[PDB]
């Protein structure tokens, strides 16, 4: 396939931000729950 | 210099297919022979040699003496 160059390029730094934010969005809430499992169980 | 010889120019992909498929078939036979000697017959012979002079009572008495059983001290 051929395509145009990006209309709104995403530089290496903008990609590192989108990648971090994306991973944190899956990791932090689940991490919070697994971390506090003991609190939940012997509560 | 010298002219170059006319090489084969036709059926090159078909030819390669034929040679390798027959290669695959001869490897498949070689593997089954390895398999039937390394796994299948090995198993058949480990079982048969185990039970050839197996003495089940003597096996029981060793287990009993080692204290494994509830019904037999």
């Amino acid at each position: 396939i051929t395509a145009k160059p990006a209309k709104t390029p995403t530089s290496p730094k903008e990609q590192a931000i989108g990648l971090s934010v994306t991973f944190l969005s899956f990791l932090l809430p689940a991490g919070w729950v697994l971390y506090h499992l003991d609190n939940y169980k012997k509560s | 210099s010298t002219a170059l010889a006319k090489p084969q120019m036709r059926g090159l992909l078909a030819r390669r297919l034929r040679f390798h498929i027959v290669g695959a078939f001869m490897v498949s036979l070689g593997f089954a022979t390895f398999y039937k000697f390394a796994v299948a017959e090995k198993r058949k012979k480990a079982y048969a040699d185990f039970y050839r002079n197996y003495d089940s009572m003597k096996d029981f008495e060793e287990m009993r003496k080692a204290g494994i059983f509830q019904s037999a001290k």
């Binding site: 396939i1 051929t2 395509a3 145009k4 990006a6 209309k7 899956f26 499992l37 | 992909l13």
Partner: protein, 514 residues
């Protein structure tokens, strides 16, 4: 406008988009549940609680991945987008009923989340067998919410099936015979006939479970003359065809990807592929008791269900060989979608081969309700149905959106996922052969090493799933707009540009009879 457009749609592309978004969300839900499973099993002992919470998570993982992720993406998402383009049709036969198929799935998914929130959830297995699933051993609302969730998903799919069958039969150009429609179109029509014939039988069996639970019927209760094994027949009568429903649209997308990235104008042996998919659909209806080899069935019956299950290998093998013969002589393009399809061909074949081992009732005595079965069915679902989905998604993403993915990130994504799913499932064959049962929250110590590796693998697949989200964000964030696509002469769905206008084929294609 926005409500008119997205809540009241009668447009097959927009509805296809709704199903892709819904399935992508369900996929995150199924993935989390699959990580909770592997967290419990990742070391010896108890993490979450006893088998009840654990089996609530296993049941929900299976329902969400099957009913809310695979079926809506393959059939709702890809079927709706591509089927009418591929036959030059202006929309689906019933564009308004097509929208209700979509809109019944968030309610169905709400009822499933509700069942896991009330009481102690439905810890039943996705087969929901009584008596564990009846009103004494699963008292309260969770199981009834589950049976209702299934009734709505079953209605969504029955009406979809009717819509897809009618569209593919009735809305081709008048010159095009059924033997001039592409393979993906055939796979969706065969899938839809299977849904039509099998889901009403499920709906009858779960209804009977609903009435044994709430109206004092005893269809499955021996005290009233009923039989727990009758439920297993009615369920598997649906359950076997349902796994052919989960793979056949996969087979059709695979035929189109392999043909496309081989640079071929057509798949090898077209009528043989039509033959194979119809033979698989047919034999898929006469083999259901191979889920019941240990229930106490007569030996001749066992013998019959062994042999009829094994026959399915023949048509299924013609398809595997025909994919290989399509690659033969191709100008091979190593695109990320072609890697998903190559992975599919090899790893679907390994998992179809352990289905063949499991067809033998004698061996199945020892393999049944062990992880050997779990390994089988993840090779075909996580490395079969899911591989065709990812291959299909990256191939058609530029059609549906008008934007390119970054190919190097998509190759990276492939590689990670490929390592994680093999690490996860391969060692489960050994846990199976050595005797580890299904639906266990903990295992004798001996099973430790393969469970530890299995769970490390499931974390590697996690990383691939998170990366996939970033990769879709990067495409929409950069806005690289599609220009030219190759091989449009044999791939009609690209011929109206990327993305196609809201209305396509307002003027139908011209095809003469000759």
């Amino acid at each position: 406008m926005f409500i008119n457009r997205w809540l009241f749609s009668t447009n097959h592309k927009d509805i296809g988009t709704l199903y892709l978004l819904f399935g992508a969300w369900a996929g995150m839900v199924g993935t989390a549940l699959s990580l909770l499973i592997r967290a419990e099993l990742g070391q010896p002992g108890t993490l979450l609680g006893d088998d009840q919470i654990y089996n609530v998570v296993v049941t929900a993982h299976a329902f969400v991945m099957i009913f809310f992720m695979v079926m809506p993406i393959m059939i709702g998402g890809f079927g709706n987008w591509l089927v009418p383009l591929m036959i030059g049709a202006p929309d689906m036969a019933f564009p308004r009923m097509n929208n209700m198929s979509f809109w019944l799935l968030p309610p169905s998914f709400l009822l499933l989340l509700a069942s896991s929130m009330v009481e102690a959830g439905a810890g039943t297995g996705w087969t929901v067998y009584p008596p564990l699933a009846g009103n004494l051993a699963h008292a309260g609302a969770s199981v009834d919410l589950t049976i209702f969730s299934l009734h709505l998903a079953g209605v969504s799919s029955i009406l979809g099936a009717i819509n897809f069958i009618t569209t593919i039969i009735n809305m081709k150009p008048p010159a095009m015979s059924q033997y001039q429609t592409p393979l993906f179109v055939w796979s969706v029509m065969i899938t839809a006939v299977l849904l039509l014939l099998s889901l009403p039988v499920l709906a009858a069996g779960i209804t009977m479970l609903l009435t044994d639970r709430n109206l004092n019927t005893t269809f499955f209760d021996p005290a009233g003359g009923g039989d727990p094994i009758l439920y297993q027949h009615l369920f598997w009568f649906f359950g076997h065809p349902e796994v052919y429903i989960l793979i056949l649209p996969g087979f059709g997308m695979i035929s189109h990807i392999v043909t496309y990235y081989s640079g071929k104008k057509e798949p090898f042996g077209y009528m043989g592929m039509v033959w194979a998919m119809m033979s698989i659909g047919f034999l898929g209806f006469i083999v259901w008791a191979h889920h019941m080899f240990t229930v106490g069935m007569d030996v001749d019956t066992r013998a019959y269900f062994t042999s009829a299950t094994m026959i399915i290998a023949i048509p299924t093998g013609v398809k595997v060989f025909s994919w290989l013969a399509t690659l033969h002589g191709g100008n091979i393009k190593w695109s990320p979608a072609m890697m998903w399809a190559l992975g599919f061909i090899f790893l679907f074949t390994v998992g179809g081969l352990t289905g063949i081992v499991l067809a033998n009732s004698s061996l199945d005595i020892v393999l049944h309700d062990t992880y050997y079965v779990v390994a089988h069915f993840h090779y075909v679902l996580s490395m079969g149905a899911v591989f065709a989905i990812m291959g299909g998604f990256v191939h058609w993403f530029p059609l549906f959106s008008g934007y390119t993915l970054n190919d190097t990130w998509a190759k990276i994504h492939f590689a990670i996922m490929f390592v994680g799913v093999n690490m996860t499932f391969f060692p489960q064959h050994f846990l199976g052969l050595s005797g580890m049962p299904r639906r266990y929250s903990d295992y004798p110590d001996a099973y430790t090493m393969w469970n530890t590796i299995s769970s490390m693998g499931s974390f590697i697949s996690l990383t691939a799933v998170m990366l996939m989200v970033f990769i879709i964000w990067e495409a929409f964030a950069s806005k690289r707009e599609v220009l030219t696509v190759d091989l449009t002469t044999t791939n009609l769905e690209w011929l109206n540009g990327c993305p196609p206008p809201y209305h396509t084929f307002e003027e139908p294609t011209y095809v003469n009879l000759k």
